[PDB]
Amino acid sequence: TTTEVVMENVTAFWEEGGTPVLKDINFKIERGQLLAVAGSTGAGKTSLLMVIMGELEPSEGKIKHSGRISFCSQFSWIMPGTIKENIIGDSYDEYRYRSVIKACQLEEDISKFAEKDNIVLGEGGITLSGGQRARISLARAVYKDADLYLLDSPFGYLDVLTEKEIFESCVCKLMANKTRILVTSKMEHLKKADKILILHEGSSYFYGTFSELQN
Ligand SMILES: Nc1ncnc2c1ncn2[C@@H]1O[C@H](COP(=O)(O)OP(=O)(O)OP(=O)(O)O)[C@@H](O)[C@H]1O
Ligand SMILES: [Mg+2]
């Protein structure tokens, strides 16, 4: 069976007695596919990922998934530790690390530190820009050997050309055979996705292919 993620008629609430944050959501992702998730602010995109990760329990419907998840938060975060430690976690693969550094354009940033990627981040440490933090957080999520990659608006703070270059080098190329969900608004990104889910006010506006969306 190639099917990796199934959501069936999911409705969910963050608050008991509140308004549902997701209403009758459906999608299916096969192994290696890219699902783009789009929609305006507050539409429920991050909430959808929280359902997949088990942080938000459905009040009806089913989320079917078994496997390791790697999550890139839309609020990019840094741990105390070196740049290399922030990215690699528990399993060292030098070739994979170099490929992720390259695809996230981190070589130029690292090259400017005397300690290179052994520079130690933390309280009293150097200050990283929003865009440097986003690319380190993306590197960490993409480096992990996982079964499903949940990339929640990972290009924060990047200018338009950098976002295009990294969407191509990381999400399209480096991760070409990985099962991926990307929260993104750019029509250029949706055009490359295998499936698209557009949310509006917690409901499914559209679920289909880009050609189906153009129609
Ligand atoms: N952990 C949480 N606890 C309670 N409410 C939450 C939580 N996370 C999100 N919400 C709420 O759920 C609704 C949907 O927001 P969500 O963050 O899923 O939207 P989004 O589509 O990810 O928005 P954005 O594009 O701004 O990131 C909002 O009303 C928000 O306040
Ligand atoms: Mg969000």
Q: Pick the residue whose CA is nearest to atom 9 on ligand 1.
A: 47
Cα separation, 59 vs 34, whole angstroms = 27
Other CB atoms within 10 A of residue 128 CB: 17
202 lines ligand 1 (CB under 6 A): no
Cα separation, 119 vs 70, whole angstroms = 24
Check if the beta carbon of residue 12 is closer than 8 Å to that of residue 47. yes
Strand bridging mode 81-82 / 195-200: unpaired
Q: How was this structure determined?
A: X-ray
Q: Which of 72, 36, 86 is nearest to 207 (CA)?
A: 36
Q: Which residues make Cβ contacts (< 8 Å) with residue 214, sequence separation at least 6?
A: none
From the CA of 51, how far away is ligand 2's center (Å)? 13
Cα separation, 68 vs 174, whole angstroms = 18
